A = this chain, B = another copy of it.
């Protein structure tokens, strides 16, 4: 049994300040095209000189040093859900943003036309809702896909709100073409930190956009 069970899943009704998870998926994601790491804090992270409405430096934390050097100084694209609480490169990183993973090679990884993907959503067992998600990458991180999914469901199904969720449990499952499938829980532990919760993107898991499937499971009450 690789897939979770009722008891394994976190209940949104026990979470304090679940609005923090809400603000992460409701707001825009950090996206950048064809950039190169300019610095490094620890051996398993990389820093980029890119900018967004609230930052001019972005620090991504990857699986380990091997993955960091694998992408260091190499031309890559960034797609990630960022946080600010407890993020900085010292008392000399006034406007930094942090994320985990969300890194993909830029060269030869784009599609002419976006590749739409169906997201099968089940609620209390009943698979009663399906929608489309799209990407421009041949190899897209699970994080990019995940965000687009939770963003859509946050706007259209109140998966998240500045407060409670109308759902009790929920989780996203990715089914790779031949590799093993994996999942992420939509809700954190009762007392959590944005930084700890986002570690789920730390492994930088990437997928083949043309052959991967996505499944969401929600429970109400």
Contacts and interface: CB of A to CB of B under 8 A. Distances in A.
Interface of A: 17, 19-20, 23, 54, 56, 83-86, 88-89, 91-95, 162, 191, 193-194
Given A17-B94, A94-B17, A95-B23, A85 B85 contact: no
A88 B85 contact: yes
Contacts of A86: 88-89, 91, 94
Contacts of A84: 84, 94
A95 B85 contact: yes
If over half of A's interface residues share one DSSP class (helix, strand or loop), that class is named, otherwise mixed; here it is: loop
Contacts of A83: 94
A193 B85 contact: no
A195 to B, nearest CB: 9
Given A85-B88, A86-B89, A89-B86, A94 B20 contact: yes
Given A54-B54, A84-B84, A20 B91 contact: no
A92 B193 CA distance: 8
A54 B95 CA distance: 13
Nearest to A16: B92
Contacts of A17: 92, 94
Contacts of A194: 94
A83 B94 CA distance: 9
A94 B56 contact: no
A101 B55 CA distance: 25
Nearest to A88: B85
Nearest to A191: B92
A177 to B, nearest CB: 37
A72 B16 CA distance: 26
A92 B85 CA distance: 10
Contacts of A88: 85-86
Given A85-B88, A89-B86, A20 B54 contact: no
A59 to B, nearest CB: 13
Nearest to A85: B94
A205 B171 CA distance: 52
A193 B20 contact: no
Contacts of A91: 85-86, 193
